[PDB]
């Protein structure tokens, strides 16, 4: 069985790795095994002197703090975003662009970006006067919490995977991870996309064709939209993967809508299981969010992402075709 798992983990560089099998094959440890595999693939343990037992211990603690009883925002989603970010980092148009520390930041940020998600939206947490919303003053409530939890777990026993980074290295990594995870809040998406469009329109490259990033502002914005793309990459995956993601997000949305209905609150969009159009919501999701973003990212790394954009447009047509 580890033989099969080890074979499925050979695909870790491929879009459309079957992350759900890896979840089953790994005993519901997709985040640990995929993270461990990717760190070995990128030689990160050696570059940053990460003891392997420390890495495993942190990853398993971190994975434990995703909710097994939340349908979408769980450790499988975390593993999938880690692995999608890992592929996006390897695109030819970005070769030698980012430092090891920046690569570490983006992969780490992807691993922690939804930890301890309770399965309800920011607006729900605000409207129900939750402790989370009270702590974080209604601003990117979930995303601030994911960060706090992700960094806090580094202090548990034998969990500081960054123990051998220099002081300046940790400082920079910490700031970069915060900037990246706060960018996963959808309230930031329009401004993020506008900057990405502006960068594409004014795009600069080097002699060897690779993207040229002069300054922190441009470098972090690319890493922010990269992880954001990976977060919104479900409709770009092979359809049998996409559809299982759609099942999971809709079940989590419906359960929030049930709570909203129990409390006499207005039901959030797409959360009313008695008035839901799964298919229409996926088409609108693609048309108004995912395709605008992925089309702009494809422009940035053209033509590296042509196949991923083709898949997204095929999946959009397929969900559209299923509207009665």
Under 8 Å between Cβ of 142 and 107: no
- In the complex, minimum distance from the CB of residue 146 to Zn ion, in angstroms, rounded to a whole number: 9
Among 50, 249, 293, 312, binds ligand 8GO (CB under 6 A): 249
Indicate the residue among 114 and 260 with the shorter CB distance to Zn ion: 114
| 36 marked as part of a ligand binding site | no
CB of 259 to Mg ion, least distance (A): 19
| Of the candidate residues 160, 231, 252, 260, the single one contacting Zn ion (CB under 5 A) | 231
Between 39 and 245, name the residue whose CB sits nearer to ligand 8GO: 245
Are the C-beta atoms of 254 and 271 separated by less than 8 Å? yes
With contacts defined by CB under 5 A, how many residues of the chain interact with Mg ion? 2
Task: Say if CB 289 and CB 189 are below 8 A apart.
Answer: yes
Backbone angles phi, psi at 122, to 5 degrees: -60, -45
262 φ/ψ angles, rounded to the nearest 5 degrees? -60, -35
Indicate the residue among 61 and 281 with the shorter CB distance to ligand 8GO.
281
Segment contacting Zn ion by CB under 5 A, of 37-45, 56-64, 223-231, 244-252 = 223-231
Asked if residue 114 binds Zn ion (CB under 5 A), the reply is yes
- Cβ of residue 126: shortest distance to ligand 8GO, in angstroms? 14
CB nearer to ligand 8GO: give 36 or 228. Answer: 228
Q: Is 113 annotated as a binding residue?
A: yes
The per-residue DSSP string of 264-317 comes to: TPPPPTT--TTS--HHHHHHHHIIIIIHHHHHHHHHHTTTTTHHHHHHHHHHHH
Of residues 63, 80, 114, 160, which one binds Mg ion by CB under 5 A?
114
C-alpha span between 164 and 172 (Å, rounded): 14
What is the token pair recorded at 135?
A: 């702590």
Counting contacts by CB under 6 A, is residue 270 touching ligand 8GO? yes
**How many positions of this chain bind Zn ion (CB under 5 A)?**
2
Tell the residue number behind the tokens 């401004």, with chain if given: 191
Which one of the spans 56-64, 95-103, 113-121, 316-324 is the region binding Zn ion (CB under 5 A)? 113-121
Binding site annotation covers 73?
Answer: yes
Which CB atom, from 54 or from 282, has the smaller least distance to Zn ion? 282
Q: Which does 126 bind (CB under 5 to 8 A by kind): Zn ion, Mg ion, ligand 8GO, none?
A: none
Angle between helices 30-41 and 52-64 (to 10 degrees): 150
Would you say 40 is a known binding-site residue?
no
Q: Enter the tokens of residue 282.
A: 């996926």
Q: What amino acid positions are annotated as catalytic residues?
A: 73
Reading the block at residue 94, the tokens are 């970005």
Ranges of H-type helices in the chain: 2-8, 19-25, 30-41, 44-47, 52-64, 75-89, 100-112, 122-127, 131-136, 141-152, 167-182, 189-201, 216-231, 239-262, 278-285, 291-300, 306-321
**Does the footprint of ligand 8GO cover residue 276 (CB under 6 A)?**
no
For the CB of residue 114, give the shortest distance to Zn ion in the complex, in Å.
Answer: 4
Question: Which residues form the interface with Zn ion (CB under 5 A)?
Answer: 114, 231
Which residues form the interface with Mg ion (CB under 5 A)?
114, 184
Which residues of this chain interact with ligand 8GO, rule CB under 6 A? 186, 231, 234, 245-246, 249, 270, 281, 285, 289
């Amino acid at each position: 069985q580890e033989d099969v798992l080890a074979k499925e983990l050979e695909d870790v560089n491929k879009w459309g790795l079957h992350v759900f099998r890896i979840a089953e094959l790994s005993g519901n440890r997709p985040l640990t095994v995929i993270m461990h595999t990717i760190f070995q693939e990128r030689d990160l343990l050696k570059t940053f002197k990460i003891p392997v037992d420390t890495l495993i211990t942190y990853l398993m603690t971190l994975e434990d703090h995703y909710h097994a009883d939340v349908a979408y925002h769980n450790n499988i989603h975390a593993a999938d975003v880690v692995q999608s970010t890992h592929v996006l980092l390897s695109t030819p148009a970005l070769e030698a662009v980012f430092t090891d520390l920046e690569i570490l930041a983006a992969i780490f940020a992807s691993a922690i970006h939804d930890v301890d998600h309770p399965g309800v939206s920011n607006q729900f947490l605000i409207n129900t006067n939750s402790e989370l919303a009270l702590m974080y003053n209604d601003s990117s409530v979930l995303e601030n919490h994911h960060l706090a939890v992700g960094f806090k777990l580094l202090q548990e026993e034998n969990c500081d995977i960054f123990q051998n980074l220099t002081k300046k290295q940790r400082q920079s990594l910490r700031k970069m991870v915060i900037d990246i995870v706060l960018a996963t809040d959808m309230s930031k998406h329009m401004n993020l996309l506008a900057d990405l469009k502006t960068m594409v329109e004014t795009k600069k490259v080097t002699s060897s064709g690779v993207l040229l990033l002069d300054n922190y502002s441009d470098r972090i914005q690319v890493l922010q939209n990269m992880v954001h793309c990976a977060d919104l990459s479900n409709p770009t995956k092979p359809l049998q993967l996409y559809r299982q993601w759609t099942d999971r997000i809709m079940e989590e949305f419906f359960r929030q809508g049930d709570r909203e209905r129990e409390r006499g609150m207005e039901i959030s969009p797409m959360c009313d299981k008695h008035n839901a159009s799964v298919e229409k919501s996926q088409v609108g999701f693609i048309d108004y969010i995912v395709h605008p973003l992925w089309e702009t990212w494809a422009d940035l790394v053209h033509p590296d992402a042509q196949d991923i954009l083709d898949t997204l447009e095929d999946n959009r047509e397929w969900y559209q075709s299923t509207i009665p």
